[PDB]
Amino acid sequence: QQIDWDLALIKYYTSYPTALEFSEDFGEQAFLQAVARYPERPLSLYVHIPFCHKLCYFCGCNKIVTRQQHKADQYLDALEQEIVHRAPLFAGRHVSQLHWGGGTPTYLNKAQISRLMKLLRENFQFNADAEISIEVDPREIELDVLDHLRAEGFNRLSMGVQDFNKEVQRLVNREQDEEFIFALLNHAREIGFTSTNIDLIYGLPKQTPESFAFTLKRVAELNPDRLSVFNYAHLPTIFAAQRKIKDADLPSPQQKLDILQETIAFLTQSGYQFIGMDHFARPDDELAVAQREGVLHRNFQGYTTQGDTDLLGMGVSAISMIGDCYAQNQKELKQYYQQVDEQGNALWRGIALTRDDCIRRDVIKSLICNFRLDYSPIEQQWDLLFADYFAEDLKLLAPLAKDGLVDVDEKGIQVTAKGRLLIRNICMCFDTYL
Ligand SMILES: C[S@+](CC[C@H](N)C(=O)[O-])C[C@H]1O[C@@H](n2cnc3c(N)ncnc32)[C@H](O)[C@@H]1O
Ligand SMILES: C[S@@+](CC[C@H](N)C(=O)[O-])C[C@H]1O[C@@H](n2cnc3c(N)ncnc32)[C@H](O)[C@@H]1O
Numbered sequence: 155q156q157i158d159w160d161l162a163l164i165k166y167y168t169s170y171p172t173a174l175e176f177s178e179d180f181g182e183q184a185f186l187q188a189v190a191r192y193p194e195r196p197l198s199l200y201v202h203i204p205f206c207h208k209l210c211y212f213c214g215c216n217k218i219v220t221r222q223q224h225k226a227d228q229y230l231d232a233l234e235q236e237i238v239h240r241a242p243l244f245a246g247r248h249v250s251q252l253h254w255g256g257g258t259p260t261y262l263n264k265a266q267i268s269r270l271m272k273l274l275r276e277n278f279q280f281n282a283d284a285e286i287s288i289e290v291d292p293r294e295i296e297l298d299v300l301d302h303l304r305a306e307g308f309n310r311l312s313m314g315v316q317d318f319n320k321e322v323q324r325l326v327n328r329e330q331d332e333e334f335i336f337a338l339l340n341h342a343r344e345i346g347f348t349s350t351n352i353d354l355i356y357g358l359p360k361q362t363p364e365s366f367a368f369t370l371k372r373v374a375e376l377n378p379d380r381l382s383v384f385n386y387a388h389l390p391t392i393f394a395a396q397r398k399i400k401d402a403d404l405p406s407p408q409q410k411l412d413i414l415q416e417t418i419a420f421l422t423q424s425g426y427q428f429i430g431m432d433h434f435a436r437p438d439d440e441l442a443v444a445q446r447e448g449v450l451h452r453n454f455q456g457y458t459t460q461g462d463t464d465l466l467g468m469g470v471s472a473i474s475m476i477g478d479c480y481a482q483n484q485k486e487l488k489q490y491y492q493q494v495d496e497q498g499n500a501l502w503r504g505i506a507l508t509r510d511d512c513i514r515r516d517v518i519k520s521l522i523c524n525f526r527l528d529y530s531p532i533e534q535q536w537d538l539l540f541a542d543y544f545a546e547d548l549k550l551l552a553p554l555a556k557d558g559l560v561d562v563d564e565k566g567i568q569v570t571a572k573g574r575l576l577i578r579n580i581c582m583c584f585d586t587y588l
């Protein structure tokens with residue numbers, strides 16, 4: 155691999171600014187000013203589908219577990235009204251990207267999937283080669299749902315797996331049929347889905363280096379196009395289902411480090427490039443190519459080739475990134491419904507980024523995605539001299555640089571093989587909010 159693991163250095167950014175900075179004072183006018191800022195810009199769409207069949211005990215997502223399937227019809231009634239009110243604001247735009255996240259998008263049955271896609275296609279102008287993606291829970295679903303997604307124009311999918319280990323599944327209430335997972339992913343491949351991602355989590359109860367290595371051997375026989383391997387974030391005060399997880403079953407910190415180190419080595423051996431953070435992809439993947447070429451980008455869903463898009467987020471909790479602003483819908487379903495009914499939108503809170511916010515966003519995006527930062531381009535675009543504007547930040551950086559996390563000089567910063575896993579540490583030197 156290109157990372158070089160260093161135990162000792164290892165003892166050392168969703169968006170920027172973060173969601174901590176979103177304010178309820180950000181209202182409808184600020185939103186409309188944001189929408190008018192870049193009328194040319196390609197449009198990306200995000201739709202949040204919050205419903206899940208069953209309560210995964212590890213899960214920290216904005217989601218609603220329910221067997222009352224009719225809630226999905228009520229929710230699409232609300233999405234219809236949101237779409238009908240927001241979409242005319244974007245009549246001149248061309249949509250290059252759509253993703254459904256959640257929650258479980260495939261909670262929607264075939265008729266519901268069709269209904270939503272039809273609302274989107276009739277109210278926004280989609281490019282013929284748009285990237286249309288969805289996340290899929292490989293439980294309580296028939297293989298022919300993939301054919302239906304394909305007929306509806308979906309071309310990318312992500313599938314949660316978490317772990318194949320049966321004890322781990324039982325402890326987190328995510329029992330799943332391994333044969334069916336293989337059937338589902340291989341069927342997706344056979345009908346033309348590409349860039350297929352699977353999610354794995356390390357740090358779950360009862361996982362060890364030896365259990366996770368065995369899981370990864372299977373994953374290699376499954377042969378996904380991309381992998382996302384998340385470190386388990388355990389905060390049972392906030393995520394109530396995690397109270398069902400025994401803290402004593404969680405792996406020790408040395409165990410989690412050994413899981414991660416061995417994972418990176420084994421995925422490299424298996425032909426996957428470590429892109430960054432949670433993500434692995436093949437050397438010829440559009441993401442790996444872009445990264446080499448210095449033009450990898452990132453949004454809330456993750457890495458992407460499509461930069462400089464405005465992102466409109468629809469549905470409960472959905473975040474929009476538009477015209478140098480972030481805006482989020484109501485995160486509780488009952489106030490999402492109530493505001494959509496009364497106003498035709500669910501705008502709750504957000505931020506208009508300052509000049510300084512925008513710069514620093516671009517510094518941080520460059521470091522996170524490309525693992526380097528050329529001063530000169532930032533100096534041109536924003537009419538500044540880097541050393542000055544960032545004197546404070548560079549001072550914070552110095553100790554890190556002497557530790558070999560980054561090589562830095564008068565022209566730029568290079569994140570080293572040793573510093574790649576500590577990228578959040580590096581980016582933190584540029585965060586004014588802390
Ligand atoms: C790759 S992330 C999952 C990682 C997870 N957030 C974590 O750190 O534990 C994708 C998920 O982020 C959320 N998401 C993505 N885009 C979003 C957006 N524009 N607004 C709100 N939520 C979004 C949805 O829950 C989606 O399924
Ligand atoms: C919206 S779910 C994926 C789609 C579908 N609902 C499923 O579970 O298959 C998004 C991903 O977030 C990750 N995730 C959720 N909670 C997490 C946590 N507390 N720590 C780390 N990753 C988490 C899981 O890998 C999960 O697949």
Ligand code: SF4
Pocket residue numbers: 205206207208209210213214215217256257258291314
């Ligand atoms: S991991 Fe997925 S299926 Fe599970 S609760 Fe979270 S969002 Fe729902």
